[PDB]
Point group: D2
């Protein structure tokens, strides 16, 4: 079955941007719950599919998307954060400049759509292989990023920030750029180009 | 095993002048057939994604399974719901109808109204909620199957279900279809639901 | 313009079920923000409507639903909570028993659907004037309860509980029944019947 | 002021054999007319709700405004987008087409494919994104207007736009419509967008 991946750092390593308690709960409780429920839903869906219960299989889809998406999204997120993540590779910077003018503009545009999410969700920087272009998007709830390869995600569920930032989501979204793991994001970019 | 197109319980022209032989023919042989063919292919792709552990790909296939699978579910029910010689609601069904909607005429008006009001493609339904032990009415978008209640009688209001015969005049179609509601089938489904 | 209503109690009066800091932020920050943004969006929508910019008016709808809904929902919520809210009136209890069997069953069923909300939203007990029946429902994000009269709401946005309960939404949803303002809920029921 | 049904820029039979006189006639005189009539009524109800301060009622009217208003918007554009004597894309539009899609034939294939794939009722669009200064393609559900980009060319794939002539065979319709794309209008709209 699916497993909760270990974090690539210790729970306090992203302070002062994200607190120890937030990281601990987010990993050990929130992500764990998506994993546990994902495993259960896959079992129920298998039973429905194997027995020919099409209506029930369809009825189970939202729970698979939510918990499956939760596992997908958090798994990427932990790799996207670092205490010392460096700067974009030269190839990614050049592409950011082509597609957004500058890193400043990319940060502002993605922060803005991310901040604007109504309710729970995620902001993403992605790479579209078909159009050979960087794109930004948001996703509701735990819906996974579709139609482009995920490069950098920003979780704006309230659980991601509230204990530290309270209501002030913009401060969290602006601050998270300080701990963006550009080594990882650049590796994902390089893999997305191949 | 592979899904198949169910034979209709009557010949393509049996429902005239309420529904034309050409509508029935296209509706069964092209529309339903396409949902069945696409459903089989989508189930194969989903089975591959599940077996490979491609969770993102499995989630991405969900809309196509809901649409084609729902199409199969809905139309398969819809054929059993139609007859030239409808008959009448069983005693127990008529009594529950009077209980929950006051009269059959009220039920017909109320279901007809919501069905006519559908914006875009969809369906209207009479169902039975086992939990509350009551009859309810609802609409569904596109081919979304009826959820939360057991389906008893469905009215397809996709433009393909009427445009050839009724043109833009959907209310004529929805009012007329009551003349061919298969109450024998509906009472059976009600009995099974209780 | 719209205004932030004063709470009918002091910020610590719902302890130990809901904390002082949660109540203070929820009222002074979260609800205030919906009010402020609601006022701004109404202005922009007026300009679009008055100048004949239909496309722009439509584009502004989600922001009106979200902030408007936020104002509607929180305004009801503050009246629905009390340190000593009593018990249901006799007329409401009788109706709860008719429509749900018992208060216990109602609490369990509404708590269950409320707990199950994926992402941000609300659980509601409402009264449907047409069917003359109590119903339970959930709403996503700040979508207002539609199709029935709201009687009792449970906010399950993470901001409603996280500072105190952390991830453990079920404990908050089960506990909130201890501070349900049955005087208010019963008054709303009596008004909904007229 | 009150919305009105715009005259078509051509006679109902001018587009044959690609689109039939009966389709054009019904499409303009019944479908578009109904969106216009319903839009006027909904705007009145909305104006009343706003003026009374009935915020819940104003929010509840939003789906009907989006559907009927979008219907008006979309079809009004669609008539200007069709011609027997289309002409050809301006130099500047053809050059941008080659830039963003490689060729016109690629653009046609790509837009045709997504338009054909619409599940239920909707539209396909060529638009211009002013922010990124690029051409994009998209689909919309039901009568949702195209958002985030300026509309240039729209293809209506509601079954009413083709079933009388093409029956179930939507791809014939979508491929054929390119023979009557009004490139003079599209280049104008492109010019205006830049
Ligand atoms: Mn999270
Ligand atoms: Mn059909
Ligand atoms: Mn709240
Ligand atoms: Mn149309």
């Amino acid at each position: 079955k699916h497993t909760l991946p270990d974090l690539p750092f210790d729970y306090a390593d992203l302070e002062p941007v994200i607190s120890h308690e937030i990281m601990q709960l987010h990993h050990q409780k929130n992500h764990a719950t998506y994993v546990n429920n994902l495993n259960q839903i896959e079992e129920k869906l298998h039973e429905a599919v194997s027995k020919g219960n099409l209506k029930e299989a369809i009825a189970l889809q939202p729970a698979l998307k939510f918990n499956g998406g939760g596992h997908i999204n958090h798994s990427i997120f932990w790799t996207n954060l670092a205490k010392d993540g460096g700067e974009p590779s030269k190839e990614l910077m050049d592409t950011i400049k082509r597609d957004f003018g500058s890193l400043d503009n990319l940060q502002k545009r993605l922060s803005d759509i991310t901040i604007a999410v109504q309710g729970s969700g995620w902001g993403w920087l992605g790479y579209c292989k078909k159009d050979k272009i960087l794109k930004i998007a948001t996703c509701a709830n735990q819906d996974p990023l579709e139609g482009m390869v995920p490069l950098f995600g920003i979780d704006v569920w309230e659980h991601a920030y509230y204990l530290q930032y309270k209501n002030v989501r913009p401060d969290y979204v602006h601050a998270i750029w300080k701990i963006a793991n550009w080594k990882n994001i650049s590796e994902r970019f390089a893999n997305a180009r191949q």
